[PDB]
């Protein structure tokens, strides 16, 4: 079942990207059943739609490089 | 344009209505020859030229 | 509504039709020419086995360019055949519909067989393809009418 309308309206609610929206695949039924920004937000507080954590870009190697340049 | 003059808005309003399938009850009407709307217009094919 | 050939016995034969089927006429013809005069059950086995890409439909009339296979040596020695899946899947539907017709009439669906199978051309459908130097050419399909009659075999 299509959840394009819930990847959108979830990026718009969480204020993040479609690639960071995460819809818990075990209960796609209720996600589909909620067809509004209000009903997306109750799902956000209910824990079925979360922001995936931002992918890590560590500058530990940049710090150690500059520390080996001083 | 998002900045369209009112003339163009008024005259694009009409070409909205000008684009609909014929009412179904036209076809059953007696001594009729209308088989479909032979004046439909699609936005990617026929440009209104204005 | 009447078929090109009348059944050997009308009351004890089922019949099925389809018009303007969107499948290749040549491929379906080559299918039918392999399915003529087969038993119904063996025809279902064979044709589903064709769609399963395990036995091949010989190509004889419309054959020029068709590559060779070993899967069709038993019946066309030079082994020129293909596995037209869309054609086969469309013909299966009519074989099943005529099996159903024969069931409703009350015949021995175990003893039915392909008494008459005919594919024939239909009204082509038009599409356009765009070539070099601003030229267009037609890009048209060859839909076919498929017409078949199962009869009960007799001693």
């Amino acid at each position: 079942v299509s959840l394009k309308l819930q990847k959108r309206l979830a990026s718009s609610v969480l204020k993040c990207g479609k690639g960071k929206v995460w819809l818990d695949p075990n209960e796609v039924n209720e996600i589909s059943m909620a067809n509004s920004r209000q009903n997306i937000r109750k799902l956000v507080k209910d824990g079925f739609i979360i922001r995936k954590p931002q992918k890590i870009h560590s500058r530990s190697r940049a710090r150690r490089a500059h520390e080996a340049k001083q | 344009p998002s900045h369209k003059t009112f003339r163009i808005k008024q005259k694009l309003a009409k070409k909205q209505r000008q684009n609909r399938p014929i009412p179904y009850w036209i076809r059953m009407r007696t001594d009729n020859t209308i088989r479909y709307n032979a004046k439909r217009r699609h936005w990617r094919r026929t440009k209104l030229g204005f | 509504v009447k078929y090109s050939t009348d059944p050997a016995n009308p009351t004890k034969s089922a019949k099925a039709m389809g018009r303007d089927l969107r499948v290749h006429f040549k491929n379906t013809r080559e299918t039918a020419f392999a399915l003529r005069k087969m038993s119904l059950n063996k025809a279902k086995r064979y044709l589903e086995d064709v769609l399963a890409h395990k036995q091949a439909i010989p190509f004889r009339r419309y054959c020029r360019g068709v590559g060779r296979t070993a899967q069709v040596k038993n019946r066309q020695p030079n082994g020129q055949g293909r596995w037209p899946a869309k054609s086969a899947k469309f013909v299966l539907d009519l074989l099943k519909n005529a099996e159903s017709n024969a069931e409703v009439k009350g015949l021995d669906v175990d003893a039915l067989y392909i008494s008459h199978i005919q594919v024939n051309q239909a009204q082509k459908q038009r599409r356009r393809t765009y070539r070099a130097h601003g030229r267009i050419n037609p890009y048209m399909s060859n839909p076919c009418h498929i017409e078949l009659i199962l009869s009960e075999k007799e001693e």
Binding site: - | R7, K11, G49, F50 | -
Partner: protein, 80 residues
């Protein structure tokens, strides 16, 4: 180049809708309609195209007032 590369730059409108004739023939830079001759006092019409004349002669429109003139001639312009 000429051709495909150069047909991409059709972006600005030389002609827009005339108000006298509703054709897309109003040359803006020149401020004259290229079919009805607007804003000339008289309508641009030429005898080198009777085909162009018949497309806009009398009788191709409503004739909101002249359609009733024959009926008013009959009975000779009577009002009670």
């Amino acid at each position: 180049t000429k051709g495909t590369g150069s047909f991409g730059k059709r972006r600005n409108k030389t002609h827009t809708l005339c108000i006298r004739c509703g054709r897309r023939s109003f040359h803006l830079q020149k401020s004259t309609c290229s079919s009805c001759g607007y804003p000339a006092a008289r309508i641009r019409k030429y005898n080198w195209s009777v085909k162009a004349i018949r497309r806009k002669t009398t009788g191709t429109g409503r004739m909101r007032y002249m359609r009733h003139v024959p009926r008013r001639f009959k009975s000779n312009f009577r009002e009670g």
